RNA sequence: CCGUGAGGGAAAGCUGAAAAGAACCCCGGAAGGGGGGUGAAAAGAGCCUGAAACCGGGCGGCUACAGUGGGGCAGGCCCGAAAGGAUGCCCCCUCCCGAAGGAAACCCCGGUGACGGGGGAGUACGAGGGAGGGGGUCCAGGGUCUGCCCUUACGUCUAGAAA
RNA sequence: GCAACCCGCGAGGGGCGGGGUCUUAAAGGGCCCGUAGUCACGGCCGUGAGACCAGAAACCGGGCGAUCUAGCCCUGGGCAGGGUGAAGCGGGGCGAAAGCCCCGUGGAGGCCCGAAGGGGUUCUGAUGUGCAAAUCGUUCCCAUGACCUGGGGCUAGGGGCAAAAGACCAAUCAAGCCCGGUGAUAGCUGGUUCCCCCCGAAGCGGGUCUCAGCCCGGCCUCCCCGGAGGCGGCCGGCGGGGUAGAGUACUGAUCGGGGCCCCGGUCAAACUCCGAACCUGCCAGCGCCGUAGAAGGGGGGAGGCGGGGGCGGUGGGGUAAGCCUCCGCUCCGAGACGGGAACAACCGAGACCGGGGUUAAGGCCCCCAAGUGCGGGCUUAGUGUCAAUCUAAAAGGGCGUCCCCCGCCCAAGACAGCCGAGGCGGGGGGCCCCGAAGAUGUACAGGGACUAAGCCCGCCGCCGAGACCCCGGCCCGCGGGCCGUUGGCCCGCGUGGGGUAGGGGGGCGCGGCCGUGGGGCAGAAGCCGGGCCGUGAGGUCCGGUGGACCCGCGGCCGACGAAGAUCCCGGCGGUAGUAGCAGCGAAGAGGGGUGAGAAGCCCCUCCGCCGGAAAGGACCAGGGUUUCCUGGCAACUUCAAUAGGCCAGGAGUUAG
RNA sequence: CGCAGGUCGCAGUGGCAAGGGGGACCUGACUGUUUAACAAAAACAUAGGUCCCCGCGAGCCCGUAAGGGUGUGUACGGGGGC
RNA sequence: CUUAAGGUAGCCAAAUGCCUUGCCGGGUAAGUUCCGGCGUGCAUGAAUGGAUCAACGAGGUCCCCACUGUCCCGGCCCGGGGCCCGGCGAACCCACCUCCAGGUGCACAGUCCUGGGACCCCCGACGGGGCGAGAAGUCCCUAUGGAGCUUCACAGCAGCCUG
RNA sequence: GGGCAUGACAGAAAAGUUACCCUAGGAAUAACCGGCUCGUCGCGGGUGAGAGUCCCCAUCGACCCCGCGGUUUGGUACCCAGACGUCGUCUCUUCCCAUCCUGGCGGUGCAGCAGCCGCCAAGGGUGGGGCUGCCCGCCCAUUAAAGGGGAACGUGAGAUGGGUUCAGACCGUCGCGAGACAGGUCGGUCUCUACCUGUCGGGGGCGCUGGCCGCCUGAGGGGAAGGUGCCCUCAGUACGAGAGGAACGGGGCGCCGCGGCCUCUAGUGUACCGGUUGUCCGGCAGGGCACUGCCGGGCAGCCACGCCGUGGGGGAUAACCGCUGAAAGCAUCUAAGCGGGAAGCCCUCCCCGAGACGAGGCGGCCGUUGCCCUGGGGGCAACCCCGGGGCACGAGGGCUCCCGUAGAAGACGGGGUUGAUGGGGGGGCGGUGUAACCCCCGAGGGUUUCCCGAGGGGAGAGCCGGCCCCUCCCAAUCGCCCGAGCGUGC
């Protein structure tokens, strides 16, 4: 094998490293959360920028407990989501596949939805609810199709993003269906989904970096004593043994960046209602300003400075829950 | 033409009988193109004939879920004027003869049995060879494609070649 | 003589005898003798000649070269700047003096640093189908001298020249180049051109400066003579042998007992009293072959003289080997085809063509034709999945399980601790389990998978080759017959039909010649496609194109047949509208004009580069009209063009 | 060529131009020459040392020969080795 | 004894020491190299020159300081290739042309066997494979093949000496 | 007729050397790899003399024997001489297990701490230096440990070139000599524009049973996405004569790897601002060039030396440990049955994903039509059938246009006048560092003190922004296209 042992360069868990099929994240897994009341299990916001905040450590066992610590934070422009449709899911008896049985739409959708959907001039919402109601006894899941409102964001674009978010919180599918039916045509704010201080998961398409060499894409080492090597140094020496041939595990140049990624257990520091208290006087660089509600998350988030990020309840939460009290943000760097 | 030099040293034939060598008109910057002429024939000065490789277009067949070339059989589409048959070919029916080979039901004897034996029966049938009846139009042959069966480029040394 | 066959003569053939001659004292022996040659045409082979075609490195002869380079000679040119400070020479200080020190002046040197110039170290940089068949960048060495450099001169090939590396002597040097000897030779390597038919090998023995060759025999082929016997099989009569085994008696080893002998025991390729199977000699018979020709002999031509696989000799050697070296049958080579999962030689089996049928090996759950066939038993491990190549397995352990046998106890007082029926111990057999560990990808050995579709003992039917049987067609060998015949046709018989090298027989095609008969402007040759004939080489015809020659038949003659030689010449592809048109320290822009057409030509303005120079002035050799003017863009300039060192026309160089 | 004063910067030989230095061993004294096109060296040469053949009609060498070089020279010399 | 003599002055694990990373010191945290010693030194030694380093060195080697992207370890930027467009427009190589696994076979298969996969086409990049291309392998052997050099090979010829 | 001789004995008369080398060939024949073989080498097992205070087997294992691997060396000579680039290293991927650590278990001559031995187990790790060209080996400081092997002795159309192994040269030894030594030593050209395939990314199209839009599902594929340490408590406790000295459980944090991000810090930043040298533009100002002239700062962006995330669990199991339990009146973890049991396998988790041809589900939009020209056929009376072409209807899609959450080309994303998409203008924020003008001071000199003069001070900053906001002032226009519709059979 190798002359000296060492781990492989890069990961084979993100193979193939191709561009994402969609710029919107497509969440595969949604957790099962018991909150006592029906509620959406996720939210979508726009990544606006990064700051740092002084936060008092609220972990009693932590070695910085009671002290003020500077933490890098991410700001998400989070205007309310407009609930357009409600869809029901059953299980196919032939294979157990989750299959949609039907969906009821609001009768008059907004004009912005016509930019992305071929909709009828008016929906027969009552008839669609009657059609859905006969599938209630076999329903295993219910989700709401929601749309973003980019006019209320700092981007100011008009085309919305449409995605399904499941309704959870209680173990009764009928209560979930009733809550989803009640949500039709209304708007959900981030405070209605999450609470400050809780952990979430973030899913998003990371920043695109275009075609990149093997040194940056996989972290392969430049050839030592770089000037000694004819035909360059930003390369692997060999590209494989004689047998097998070129494998799929061999590092090669290609697309880097624009891939869907999931990051676990990011703590919601704040959920503000007016973005003026968080926007810098110069504004967020390359984004603009925040006027509506915003989410202040701890740490970093995948994606560029305008990407749509999906926050969900955690699927791999730690054993010890965070403190029930809201975290104390003493000062954000955007403030004076 | 090559080498300082002694020396070395190619490629390259063909209008038409007669220039009758293409008048004249339109276009083009021009090479030139269209029309129109000469000539038995463009044989057009890049000049007898004018092959293949090669490239362009038309036509026929295939063409994005199926691994390629060659052969045999069956078929789909296309050609099938002449030089081949059309007294053909194919279908059906009937009749006759028929090599080697050769059943079945059913009845009888035996075996646990798979099966054997007597009769049925050298029977029905059987390569092929003759005769006739009706029905139809092409048949042979060719191009391409598909299905099934078969199939390890050539020349060479070698004990041994797809190597 | 029914014939069978017997008898007589008996050319040719065979033998003896006789004769000529040599040797010898002679005998004996050697050669020769009772008839056929010669000339020619065609063919095959041998030797020489270039000798089927192509191929050396070399060697010799006569000539050419010192524009390169090596050395030296004659006559010119060149080397910024700085530093150090030799001999020599002055002053100052110090001594009683002999005498020391300090400073200056001076300008030596195969001296130092460093431009030009010369050289060529590092990056083992770039390049490496390059800018270039030796370059470029960078870093370096010398740079007043054994220094660098121009012109002229000398030294020439077995010779020169060499501060020496066998360097250099015109991109050529452990002996130049040119032409010639010369088609040098080559046991070696490559190539060697049409068809059908008959037969059909070898890699063995001996000799060889022989081991990649060759000759003599064995093996093949063709022709002839000869004349009736022959032998890969078998029985029998009469013989030979000394292996396997056996023995331990001769020659040797070797373990015990008993008293140098006796007894038991272990061995022998180089031991043998005995001794097979088996092989082999003669005779008789059988079997088969043979007068359509046995034995035997003569002549022509070879190939080949590298073998290989399976099985057997415990062959001999070796740890073993798909190892080395012998012996025998068979098969591959030179043999199709079925099975083996592929596979030259393992099994079956030997193929002219087409069809029908039946079988061989092997198989019959699917892939895949034929059986989820039949009876009994075993296996629980997916063990295993019907010989070998071919992918496996040992000592050892296991009542895991199925079974066979033997010894003992139990006489119901036997094994376990009164109970009541079997218990204990030993040996062996079958299958399976552990022993059992590898490298790209699944219980691998075909895959699916199977609890039988595995294994053992038996059984029944079926499928399945080109083999065997039948039919039709074709061809061959041999014999017979007919025809005026360098040949053609017919018939009969064949347990006739594979075939490389090679031998033998016939035919097709190409160019011409001797004859003979014809076609062609109402369309020859050639070219494109197509039909028909012929096993085939090939022939012939149709339609189109084309525009003057061509063909059938008999005979003869050749510069006579290509798919290949890293073949020769030419044309043309894919690669590919791809590489390159970067690198070496400059570059363009605006407006106008001309013009078919302008980023690029002409003019102005702006911007830039050199400026002891890849760049301004002069000029040698060499080049030779490239100079100037006018016009132009078919070709040339790594793109364009109206531009040009290009093309066309004209002109131009004045000396005491 | 020098002296005094003032003054700015991160940086005053400000760009350009422009030595890293020291110790020890082996080896060849040094400068010089060399395999044009893979070897620049410790290889060659070198001054210095030493030996040999030679008094000239010599020694050594070239030429077939005629003759030639060393030699327009002479042992403080010519030639030949290490 | 001895081929005559038997290595003197010196110098050494040396560019000369096999054993051998010799043994002892120094240097480093760690030293097969290096330096200073030791020497019955395979196989050191005197113009075959010994010892010997002042000066000189594009010589070979070890250490120290300074220095630093050599490296921990990689990042950003600049010019030219690059990529795209317009114009010009080749070459190498080429029997045909090839998805993967495990086998088999002139023993290392694109073409054979048994499997696993693949919708087809186009662009960029690389260099694992095509025992990739270039060059009738210089390494080894054979040939009754060469060339040059050597001498105590077999012969010969000049030259010199002698009668 | 006898002898004189060829012994290489079926009869030439015959020494070396070439690494300066040349030719013709040869896998008939070596060197490397490959093939066959395994003596050798590495590994496993049977046996038990003997040692182990006693005690064969905790730990060894004499004398012998049976095996396995292909990891060293050798044998052979089957392939390859018109050529498979020869050691080591770098770089990068994968596979094996005969396991060095990490997980599980057992034995012990296991009191604890430690150590030794065996079994399962290959998911992860196995590092940094000194010495030698090395491989190997020894050593240093750490560490959980610092395992070993295969892949054409993996990988030179990827590198390097220290070694070996050309031509030069020196030493020692050998040779009369030229020369030779797998003895030492110094020097000594690493060619190729990638045709096919593979791999990694990026595009066009057809198909999915009429076309399309949006949202989903999940067959299957990839994954290491995680691995591993330390400290405190336990506890100076258990254990122990003492010395010494644990563990389960709880709390805290690293290191290695992986995936993101740019708030901070660091780097860069030939956008930008300033200082300054030499020269040219007549001087000031401003500027050219010194290949950003050099120096200092530095927004955005990118980036790491910075920051963030990076888990437990379930199931069947291995080695085995147990329950019940007969065969076999007892006993027995096993035969039937049942319980427990690993960093390993599957799922959970992350990424790709309907070309998943059984080409999927849901909701919606659309088409499911007409007209014109021309050809042929049927019956001619209308008419009808079929071939070709054009036009309209039509959901949806693209090109052109302004851009950037994107980007080699393609693609993707946003906007496109019911518009804030790029520019302009205004404002915000920010970089540099305080322009011009004006006034004050200025070492000293002179036209004495209204002049020169490097320079300091005050007010003023000045310049600039590949960032944010507002504002229709300019330009997102004009235009060019694709597009289902019909029959058939089962
Ligand atoms: Mg290099
Ligand atoms: Mg012509
Ligand atoms: Mg016809
Ligand atoms: Mg006819
Ligand atoms: Mg051969
Ligand atoms: Mg061979
Ligand atoms: Mg042969
Ligand atoms: Mg062949
Ligand atoms: Mg001859
Ligand atoms: Mg000769
Ligand atoms: Mg001569
Ligand atoms: Mg000259
Ligand atoms: Mg000098
Ligand atoms: Mg070099
Ligand atoms: Mg280089
Ligand atoms: Mg190159
Ligand atoms: Mg100098
Ligand atoms: Mg030499
Ligand atoms: Mg010569
Ligand atoms: Mg010649
Ligand atoms: Mg025969
Ligand atoms: Mg041969
Ligand atoms: Mg007998
Ligand atoms: Mg015997
Ligand atoms: Mg015996
Ligand atoms: Mg015998
Ligand atoms: Mg032989
Ligand atoms: Mg044999
Ligand atoms: Mg077979
Ligand atoms: Mg069947
Ligand atoms: Mg055995
Ligand atoms: Mg098995
Ligand atoms: Mg035959
Ligand atoms: Mg004739
Ligand atoms: Mg041929
Ligand atoms: Mg040619
Ligand atoms: Mg071409
Ligand atoms: Mg181009
Ligand atoms: Mg290019
Ligand atoms: Mg300049
Ligand atoms: Mg200038
Ligand atoms: Mg000049
Ligand atoms: Mg001119
Ligand atoms: Mg002119
Ligand atoms: Mg001219
Ligand atoms: Mg400089
Ligand atoms: Mg020197
Ligand atoms: Mg020098
Ligand atoms: Mg050289
Ligand atoms: Mg050199
Ligand atoms: Mg010397
Ligand atoms: Mg001296
Ligand atoms: Mg001497
Ligand atoms: Mg001594
Ligand atoms: Mg040394
Ligand atoms: Mg010594
Ligand atoms: Mg000596
Ligand atoms: Mg000496
Ligand atoms: Mg000596
Ligand atoms: Mg000396
Ligand atoms: Mg010395
Ligand atoms: Mg094999
Ligand atoms: Mg191939
Ligand atoms: Mg050769
Ligand atoms: Mg050669
Ligand atoms: Mg040699
Ligand atoms: Mg010979
Ligand atoms: Mg010669
Ligand atoms: Mg002999
Ligand atoms: Mg061989
Ligand atoms: Mg070998
Ligand atoms: Mg190899
Ligand atoms: Mg062993
Ligand atoms: Mg034991
Ligand atoms: Mg081996
Ligand atoms: Mg081979
Ligand atoms: Mg080869
Ligand atoms: Mg290769
Ligand atoms: Mg090669
Ligand atoms: Mg194991
Ligand atoms: Mg290798
Ligand atoms: Mg290479
Ligand atoms: Mg390679
Ligand atoms: Mg080297
Ligand atoms: Mg050498
Ligand atoms: Mg000597
Ligand atoms: Mg060397
Ligand atoms: Mg390349
Ligand atoms: Mg390419
Ligand atoms: Mg990272
Ligand atoms: Mg800067
Ligand atoms: Mg100024
Ligand atoms: Mg200027
Ligand atoms: Mg500049």
Q: Cβ distance A260 to A202 under 8 Å?
A: no
Count the Cβ atoms, other than its own, within 10 Å of residue A19.
15
Contact criterion met (CB below 8 Å) for A221 and A227: no
The span from the CA of A101 to the CA of A119, in Å, is: 19
Supply φ then ψ for residue A193, to 5 degrees: -95, -60
Whole-angstrom Cα distance, residue A292 to residue A143? Answer: 26
The answer to whether A204 and A25 are in contact (CB under 8 A) is yes
Chain breaks in chain A (C to N over 2.5 A) after: none
Q: Is A54 helix (H, G, I), strand (E, B) or coil?
A: strand
Solved using? cryo-EM
Contact between the CB of A3 and strand C at under 7 Å: no
Tokens linked to A332: 């954000």
Backbone angles phi, psi at A101, to 5 degrees: -95, -25
Using the structure, give the distance in angstroms from the CA atom of A241 to the C1' atom of E142, rounded to a whole number.
40
Give the tokens for residue A174.
């009928």
CA-based nearest residue to A137, from A174, A181, A99:
A174
Q: How far is the CA of A319 from the centre of ligand 31 (A)?
A: 62
Q: How far is CA A24 from the centre of its chain?
A: 9
**Long-range CB pairs of A320-324, under 8 A, 24+ apart, other chains included:** A322/A58, A322/A197, A322/A198, A322/A199, A322/A267, A323/A58, A323/A59, A323/A197, A324/A197
Residue A195 CA, ligand 12 centroid: distance in Å: 101
Taking the C-alpha atoms of residue A202 and residue A263, their distance in angstroms, rounded to an integer, is: 5
Return residues with CB closer than 5 A to ligand 1 (ion).
A 230
Distance CA A271, CA A208 (A): 28
Q: What is the Å distance from ligand 65's center to A80 Cα?
A: 85
Burial of A311 (0-12, 13-18, 19+ CB in 10 A): buried
Resolution value in angstroms: 2.4
């Amino acid at each position: 094998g190798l002359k000296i042992n060492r781990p492989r360069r890069g990961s084979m868990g993100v193979y193939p490293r191709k561009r994402a099929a969609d710029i919107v994240p497509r969440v595969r897994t949604w957790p099962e959360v018991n909150l006592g009341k029906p509620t959406l299990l996720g939210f979508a916001a726009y990544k606006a920028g990064m700051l740092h905040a002084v936060v008092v450590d609220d972990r009693p066992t932590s070695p910085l407990y009671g002290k003020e610590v500077v933490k890098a934070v991410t700001v998400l422009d989070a205007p309310p989501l407009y609930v357009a449709a409600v869809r029901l899911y059953t299980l196919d008896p032939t294979n157990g596949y989750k299959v949609a049985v039907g969906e009821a739409w609001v009768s008059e959708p907004p004009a912005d939805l016509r930019r992305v959907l071929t909709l009828p001039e008016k929906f027969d919402t009552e008839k669609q609810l009657k059609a859905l109601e006969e599938y209630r006894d076999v329903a295993v899941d219910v989700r709401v199709l929601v749309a973003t409102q980019p006019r209320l964001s700092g981007i100011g674009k008009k085309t919305p993003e449409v995605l399904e978010i499941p309704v959870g919180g209680v173990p009764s599918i009928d209560e979930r269906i009733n809550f989803a039916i009640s949500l039709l045509g209304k708007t959900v704010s981030p405070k209605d989904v999450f609470t400050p201080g809780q952990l979430v998961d973030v899913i998003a398409v990371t920043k695109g970096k275009g075609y990149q060499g093997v040194v940056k894409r996989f972290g392969v080492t430049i050839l030592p004593r770089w000037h000694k090597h004819r035909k360059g140094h930003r390369r692997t020496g060999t590209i494989g043994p004689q047998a097998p041939a070129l494998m799929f595990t061999q590092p090669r140049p290609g697309q880097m960046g624009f891939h869907q990624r999931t990051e676990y257990n990011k703590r919601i520091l704040k959920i503000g209602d007016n973005g003026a208290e968080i926007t810098p006087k110069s504004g967020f660089p390359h984004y603009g300003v925040i006027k509506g509600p915003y989410i202040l998350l701890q740490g970093s988030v995948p994606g560029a400075r305008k990407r749509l990020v999906v926050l969900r309840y955690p699927v791999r939460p730690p054993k010890k829950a965070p403190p029930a009290a809201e975290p104390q943000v003493v000062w954000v760097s955007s403030q004076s």
